[PDB]
Structure formats: C-alpha cells, structure tokens
Structure 1
Amino acid sequence: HGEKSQAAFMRMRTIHWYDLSWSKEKVKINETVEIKGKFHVFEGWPETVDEPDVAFLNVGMPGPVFIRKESYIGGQLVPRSVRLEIGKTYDFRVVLKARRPGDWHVHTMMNVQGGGPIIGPGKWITVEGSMSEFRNPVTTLTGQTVDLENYNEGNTYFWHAFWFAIGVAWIGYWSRRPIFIPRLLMVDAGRADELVSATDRKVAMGFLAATILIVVMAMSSANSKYPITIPLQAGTMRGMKPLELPAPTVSVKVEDATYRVPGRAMRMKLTITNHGNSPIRLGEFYTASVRFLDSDVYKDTTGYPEDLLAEDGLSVSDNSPLAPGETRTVDVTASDAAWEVYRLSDIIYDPDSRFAGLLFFFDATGNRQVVQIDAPLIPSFM
C-alpha cells in the first residue's frame, strides 16, 4: 500500500519477485497462511540504494494483523537481518498467523539497510473470527509455556504504577503547602531558609534511601526469579544460500524501448536468440510487480493479484515458436491499466529513465526460461 509512490525506475530495478504463491486466501483467527516465492536481486542496483549487504525479509501489512511465525531465505530461518548478493536469486517462505479480523493487503517486502523498503506484490487476505481468540504460545528453555499476548503485562503495569505512585507521592507531599506565588515571594524578599526545614530534609532522605533500597531489592528479586536470562539476540546473518539456477538458453537484446506520454502501454523491440533444442515462445513480461501475460502462450494459475495481473496485456508482433538456433526481432507491447494505476508511467518524473524486468519464455512441453532485460526507456509524446 506503500508502493505506487516510490520512483518507477527504482521499483523496476531493485528486486524482481516471481513464482509467488499464497497457501490460503481466507483464514480464521490462529490459522496459518504461508507465502512462498523467489526474488532476484537486479545487477543494475541503483547507486542511490546501498548494496543489500544488510537486508531484512519483512511483511507489508497494517500493523500486527498477522504475526510472523517464521520467515526463511533459502531454507533457513531468518529472524535477523541478512546479507544478499547482487545478481543472485533467492527463494523465500514467510509463515503468518492470523490475529486481527478484516481484509488485509499483505505484501512481501525487503528492507535494505541504506535504501529503504522494496515492496513486492500485495495480496488481499481475509481474516475472520475474533481477536480475543488469538493465542501466541511459546515454550522457553526453562520449561514454561507463556502467551506472548499478555506475558509480563501485569508485572510491567505493576512496576510502572508503583514508581509513578512514588513520584506522585513526592510531588503531593511538597504540594500540600502553597506552591508558587507565596514561595516565590519568600525566596525573593530576603533569604528564604524557611520553606525547606525539618522534617522536610528527613522526608527527602527517606525518599532517597527507600528509592535506592527498593531498586536494589527489586533487582535482586528479579534475579532470583528468572535466574536464567540471555541478552537480545541480534546481528546480520551471512551465508544466505542462493538458488543455483541453470544458465538460460534464451538471449534477449533490447533494441530501444518506448512508452507513450500519456498512455497505459510500454513498447520495446527485442532481438531473441533461441539456444538449446526446443521451440520457445514469449509468455510473460514482469517489470515491477506487474505481470503482462500473453494468454495464448501462458496462463496464471497461482492466484496472482488481479490488479497486478494483465492476462492479455502482453502483445508480441510475431509470437510464433522460435526454433533453436534461430534469431528474430519482434515488437513487444505491454499494455494494461496497471501501468497507470501503479504509476509506472511516472518514470517521466524520474531522474533515471531506465527500466528492468523479467521475460518468461515457454516451450511446447511447458518448461520455462527466465531472462532479464534492462534498457533505457524513452518517452514518446507525438
């Protein structure tokens, strides 16, 4: 819900999310929904964004309407920040547990230490039930099971109220007598030395000694109880395992790319060379969370968000099968209302008019090839 405002070229060339899947579209309270997919770190990472040396796999959502039970990059849990390598493809998996009823737009996002949020596609997930039914149990290494919704809440309230009461008692003790104007007049007109006299000093000594003694006793008691404590666990985690993708058998060279101002379409001319031994066909163009599909070649079945999915938004001038070894140049047009709804047309406002995306090529048997394209995007006005 935080994208459509970021720069179009920065959304195009940071991170490409694909193979996204959602386990469920509608859940009950305490029910789990799992989000899977892959993201590729673009080679032409913008210089204004710091390299993803420190990155965190986050969830885009309006507060804890879900709780993040687990999150994985590769196959290993990532509760801390992680290091990503430019040009590598990683697979991710986020497990969410429903907490608050309603209709929520859930995004998978990557926060980069020096570049800000990179928001992936968002999907509407319905939560039904009552928040009062939500439980977040956890078992500690000390052998006790607690609910994270209310654990330590009573202790926190008690201690804060106790110390607030001590301070209020001090202030009220001094506030029983007249406060401002008579005391000001006494201090000004001659030496005061009358508004602070025993047993006021004795009361202050008692307050100070009691404060120190209570702090020490409370610390000792909180050490006898909970004798086993550990510090906060933090630190960027290295050695994220990237996907070992096979080398693509399709090479694509972008010969100019244009978009009409104003308009809802993007046009580019590609020289596609088919290696390997199977006839390929262009099935998809993904630019920034928007999938332009050639419906005659490929159809989406993973429940991709409709406002981000162009079922027939990809038109190829000659999308006949490309025989192996054969090279041809075609005009590819990606047109959909999403191009203007998600403000991908506002790249005219950007200080770097370059686009990046993913082309998905499919053969007859159905196996697909992913190739990455990037080129300057030239607006056309007449």
Structure 2
Amino acid sequence: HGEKSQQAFLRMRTLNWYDVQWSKTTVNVNEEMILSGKVHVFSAWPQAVANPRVSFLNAGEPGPVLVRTAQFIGEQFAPRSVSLEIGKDYAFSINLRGRRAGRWHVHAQINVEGGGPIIGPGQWIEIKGDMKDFTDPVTLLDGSTVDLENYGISRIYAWHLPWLAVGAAWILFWFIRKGIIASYVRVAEGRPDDVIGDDDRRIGAIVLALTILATIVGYAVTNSTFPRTIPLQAGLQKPLTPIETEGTVGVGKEQVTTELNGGVYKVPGRELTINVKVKNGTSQPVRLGEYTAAGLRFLNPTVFTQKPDFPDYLLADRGLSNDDVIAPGESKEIVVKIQDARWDIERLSDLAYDTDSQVGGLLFFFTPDGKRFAAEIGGPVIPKFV
C-alpha cells in the first residue's frame, strides 16, 4: 500500500518488476510461502535517486504479519545490502512464515540507499490460526535451538526491571529522608549541610560500591553463560549474478529493441499512446504481448488470449495492439495504445504533476511458440489536457 502516492516517473524508471508470484495466497500460522519474481533495473536511472549500488530486498507488509525466514537476490542469500547494476536483471525470492491471522497485502520491495522505498506488486495473503501458536525456531552454532519469538526476553526484563526498581528506591529514599520544600528552604536560608553530610555520603559511598559490584557480578556471570560471542555482521555483499537466460534485456544473440519516438497521455486520465521503433534482432516473427510499468501489467488480448494469475489491481487486459508479426531482422515503427482505468487508479496519470514528464518500463514480445523476448521502453511523453 501507499506506492500509489509516489511520483509516477520515479516508479516507472527505477525498477521494472516482472514474473512476481506468491506461491500460496493462504497460510496457517507457522506455514511458509515464497514470494518471488524478477526485476530489471532501468538504464536511464533518474538523478533524483542515488545509485542502486547500495540496496535492500524486502517484503512490503504491515509489520511482521509474516516472519521472513530467508531471502535471495542476485543468486545470493541477502540478509545484508546488495548492489544492483544499472540496466541488468535480477531474480529474487523471499520465504515468509505465517504469524498474525488476518488478510494482508504483501509486496516485493527494494529500497535504494539515498533513494527511498521502491514498491513491487503485492497480493492479499490470508493467514489463519492463532498467533499464540507461532514458533520459529532457529539453530545456534553450539547445536541448540531457540524460539526467536520469545528468546532472550525474560533475561532482558530480569536485568531491566530490578535496576528500574533500584532506580526508584534511590529517588524515594532521598525524597522521604528530608524532602523537597524542607530542602529548598534549608539551602535558600543558611547553608545546606543540614541537608547533606556524612552519613548521607556514607550511604552513597555504600550504594555505589554495591552498584559496581552488582555490575561486575552480572558481567562475569553473563560471560559464563554465553562465553563465545560474535559482533553484529554487517556490510554490503559481493556483486550479484544477473539473469543470463535467455531472454531477457540485452542478453545473447537474439534481442528485441525498442526506441520510443514520442507519446501522448490524456490529462485526465486513462490513456497513453506511444510510437515504438522496434528492431527484431531475433530469428522469429514476434508480436507485442505486454507493457509493464510500476508493477502494472497492460496485456494484449490478442497474445494473452486468456489470462494470467495476477493481483486485481494491477492486471489490465488492454494494452492493444495492431497484429502483425514483426518479421525476423525487420525494423518497424508501431503505434501502441495503453488504455485502462488502472493507469488512472495507480496514479501513473499524475505524471503531469512531475518534474520529468517521461515514461519507462518493459515491453514483452512473443514468438508463435512460447518464447518471450524483452525490451526496455522509456522516454519523453507529452500530456494532452482534457
């Protein structure tokens, strides 16, 4: 949720989400599902957003309704931050584990360092059962298993509460053994000294000497339990592996290419019309299947005869069209008509408000058999008012 309020051009020209899927939409407390998909980092990465050199994968979700059990991107377990390279594609997946009952919108999400959150597509997940039943658990190196949901917590209170109590007793003691007004008056009149003097200092010298003892003891005791400890493990991870299959923007002998040649989007607010100069570097006649923008899919009903498993919200069955197998080696300019309410609803139409009136995203081209060949589209587009 909320991504609807981020600026269109930024959503469009940073991450181009695709093949995002959610494994299970329904799970009991303790049951896993994987959220997975792919991401193409847009080659004209905007100046407003720091370099995705320093980034983090995530499950957009309202607090820990599902617990993340591991995640991967690049081809790499990623508990720490990663580097995405401009203009390249990455597979990612998250394993999540049911914790609080309800119904929840769980997106793919990537945050870029001087950047902000970029929010990938999301799906409603029903989690049923009782949060009381939730467990991890998790294996230490010394062979034991802990339940992270509860682990360490009473040991915190066992240390925190007593001191908060010794805290109060020090205050009450002094307040009551010769008080506030009585003390204000003494100081303001003659000297204090009727307020403080050994044995008042003796008490303090004592209390201190106990305090440092209790501190030492608690320290040496906790080194006896827990004698081998590591510092937090932090730092960027080795460069990731991009998707080399197969494919797949700017990879292998067989490509599609798409130059944008100006475009028009009505304000307000449901249509975007674009001239695409396509080059078919493949050896097979290809039809345009799909435009994807900011999570959003605009499908060609001619190609997607019917009709994928994908969120509401989101899935638009009109990114028509013109049917004419672009021929192998051919080089043609086609007029594409993105129409659907979802453009307005996910506020891509608010592009007219931005400091950079310019689309980005991917186009998917299909052979007569299976193969999907991908091209980056992006560039200046002009608004046409009312």
Aligning the two structures, in what range does the TM-score lie when normalised by the shorter sequence?
over 0.9
C-alpha separation between the residues in 2 aligned to 1:195 and 1:277? Answer: 96
C-alpha separation between the residues in 2 aligned to 1:299 and 1:161? Answer: 65
> Which residue of 2 is the match for residue 314 of structure 1?
319
* More moved, 198-207 vs 87-96: 198-207
2:372 is aligned with 1:364: no
2:285 is aligned with 1:279: yes
TM value normalised by structure 2: 0.95
C-alpha separation between the residues in 1 aligned to 2:307 and 2:92? Answer: 20
> Where in structure 2 are the equivalents of 1:289-308 lying within 5 Å?
289-298=295-304, 303-308=309-314
* Residue deviations 1:296-329 (CA, integer Å, cap 9, x gap): 1025765211110002x1112x222222233332
> Which residue of 2 is the match for residue 380 of structure 1?
384
C-alpha separation between the residues in 1 aligned to 2:327 and 2:40? Answer: 28
* Residue deviations 1:177-216 (CA, integer Å, cap 9, x gap): 3522221111011112111133221111111111111111
C-alpha separation between the residues in 2 aligned to 1:207 and 1:128? Answer: 53
> Which residue of 2 is the match for residue 73 of structure 1?
73
Q: Among the aligned pairs, what percent are the same residue?
A: 46
> Where in structure 2 are the equivalents of 1:222-241 lying within 5 Å?
222-241=222-241
Aligned-residue offset at 1:53: 1.5
> Which residue of 2 is the match for residue 180 of structure 1?
180
C-alpha separation between the residues in 2 aligned to 1:37 and 1:152? Answer: 35
Indicate conservation of the 8 Å contact 1:256/1:375, yes or no: yes
2:274 is aligned with 1:268: yes
* More moved, 100-109 vs 266-275: 266-275
5+ residue gaps in structure 2? 246-250
2:338 is aligned with 1:334: yes
Partner amino acid for 1:252?
T
C-alpha separation between the residues in 2 aligned to 1:232 and 1:76? Answer: 19
C-alpha separation between the residues in 1 aligned to 2:308 and 2:241? Answer: 25
Partner amino acid for 1:350?
D
**What secondary structure sits across from 2:85 in the alignment?**
coil
**What secondary structure sits across from 1:4 in the alignment?**
helix
2:358 is aligned with 1:354: yes
* Residue deviations 1:52-75 (CA, integer Å, cap 9, x gap): 111111110000001110100133
**What secondary structure sits across from 1:257 in the alignment?**
strand
C-alpha separation between the residues in 1 aligned to 2:193 and 2:39? Answer: 74
C-alpha separation between the residues in 2 aligned to 1:72 and 1:58? Answer: 10
> Which residue of 1 is the match for residue 195 of structure 2?
195
* Residue deviations 1:82-139 (CA, integer Å, cap 9, x gap): 1121111111111000111111100111111111111101111111111011101111
Partner amino acid for 1:112?
V
* More moved, 264-273 vs 38-47: 264-273
In angstroms, what is the RMSD of aligned CA positions? 1.4
**What secondary structure sits across from 1:307 in the alignment?**
coil
* More moved, 266-275 vs 283-292: 266-275
Aligned-residue offset at 1:276: 2.5
C-alpha separation between the residues in 2 aligned to 1:266 and 1:178? Answer: 79
Indicate conservation of the 8 Å contact 1:18/1:38, yes or no: yes
C-alpha separation between the residues in 2 aligned to 1:336 and 1:276? Answer: 30
Partner amino acid for 2:357?
S
C-alpha separation between the residues in 2 aligned to 1:199 and 1:76? Answer: 65
* More moved, 346-355 vs 250-259: 250-259
> Which residue of 1 is the match for residue 23 of structure 2?
23
C-alpha separation between the residues in 2 aligned to 1:301 and 1:188? Answer: 85
**What secondary structure sits across from 2:5 in the alignment?**
coil
Partner amino acid for 1:153?
I
* Residue deviations 1:118-163 (CA, integer Å, cap 9, x gap): 1101111111111011101111011211100111111111111110
TM value normalised by structure 1: 0.96
> Which residue of 2 is the match for residue 96 of structure 1?
96
Aligned residues: 380
C-alpha separation between the residues in 2 aligned to 1:229 and 1:168? Answer: 33
> Which residue of 2 is the match for residue 140 of structure 1?
140
Indicate conservation of the 8 Å contact 2:22/2:36, yes or no: yes
Indicate conservation of the 8 Å contact 1:37/1:92, yes or no: yes
C-alpha separation between the residues in 2 aligned to 1:322 and 1:241? Answer: 32
